[PDB]
Amino acid sequence: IPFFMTRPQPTTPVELVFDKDHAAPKPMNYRKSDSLRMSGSATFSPKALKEVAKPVKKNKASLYVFDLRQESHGLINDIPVTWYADRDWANADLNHEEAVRRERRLLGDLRVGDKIGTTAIQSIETEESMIRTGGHQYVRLTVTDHVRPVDSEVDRFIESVRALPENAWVHFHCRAGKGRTTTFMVLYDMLKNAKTDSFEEIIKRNTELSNDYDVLTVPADEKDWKYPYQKERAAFVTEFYNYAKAHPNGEGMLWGEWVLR
Ligand SMILES: [Mg+2]
Ligand SMILES: [Mg+2]
């Protein structure tokens, strides 16, 4: 597999968007695997954190929330917000550190007292703050919606997985809870189970669990803008299976090293 270099141009205008459906006390597109001790959802509110934490609840520290979002986001008046541009490609030119810095900068540019339409800002919070206040752990990856992760972010993921305590529970989310979230549930499952389970079985159980049946499907139309991105994602997950089979739980070699053999 090649070293992965292609990417989209970032989109504009970027606008702060209040994600009102994500403000509900239950997380959207939620699903879980008790055997893998993993779950996935859309980005969620302060009140929904207790729901996400249920499978762990008497062991708060063992929940690790993996935020997969490249685009910037946070909480204003407990409402999840996104700095949105088309396809959530606002930050598509930024590497991980740049994307993390950009989100800090945009949240810092908000002020208590600002009026954005009918909203008067009274509370500004990072998502990490909200997660950690609940006694849980937080890991940020930066993945572009519709695009596979870059190799170094896959390594970042693996390094985080290798450092997990026994009996960690991992919860993935992205803005919609489909696409990126499903892919990393697949990658996590392969890290643990590629050594014993088939590629097709792993894809099958995760598409079914996530009601995300076209996560890896390549459009029939080659002029559909998603076509090259889906081809890339498919190649990536197909080779990741081979890596994870050879290096269960990332033992002995990271993905990045594997690619550059
Ligand atoms: Mg709050
Ligand atoms: Mg640059």
Domains of the chain: 1-261 (3.90.190.10)
Which ligand neighbours the alpha carbon of 122 most closely?
1
Return all residues near 157 (Cβ < 8 A) that are at least 6 apart: 66, 141, 149, 184, 187
The strand pair at 63-69 and 137-143 is best described as: parallel
SS3 label, residue 254: coil
Distance 200 CA to ligand 2 centre (A): 37
Residue 117 CA from chain centroid, whole number: 30
219 vs 230: CA distance, rounded Å: 8
The CA distance from 149 to 146, in Å, is 10
Q: Which positions make up the binding site for Mg(2+)?
A: 78, 125
Q: Which of 185, 181, 180 is nearest to 146 (CA)?
A: 180
Q: Which ligand is nearest to the CA of 98?
A: 2
Q: In angstroms, what is the span from residue 98 Cα to ligand 2's centroid? A: 8
Question: 11: CA distance to ligand 2 center in Å?
Answer: 15
Output the CA angle 159-164-167, nearest 5 degrees. 150
Say which residue the tokens 């208590």 belong to: 112
Spatial separation of the C-alpha atoms in residues 53 and 65, rounded to whole Å: 9
The structure was resolved experimentally with X-ray
Neighbours of ion ligand 1 (CB under 5 A): 78
Side-chain-side CA neighbours of residue 52 (13 Å): 34
DSSP 145-166: TTSPPPHHHHHHHHHHHHTPPT
Q: How far apart are CA 163 and CA 137, in angstroms?
A: 12
How far, in Å, from the CA of 124 to the mean position of ligand 1? 8
Name the nearest CA neighbour of 88 among 150, 147, 171: 147
Q: What is the largest CA-CA distance in the chain?
A: 56
Q: Ligand 1 centroid vs 78 CA: distance in angstroms?
A: 5
- The Å distance, Cα 175 to ligand 2 centre, comes to 24
Binding site, residues? 78, 125
CA angle 8, 81, 208 (to 5 degrees): 70
CA of 46 to the centre of ligand 1 (A): 6
Entry resolution in angstroms?
Answer: 1.7
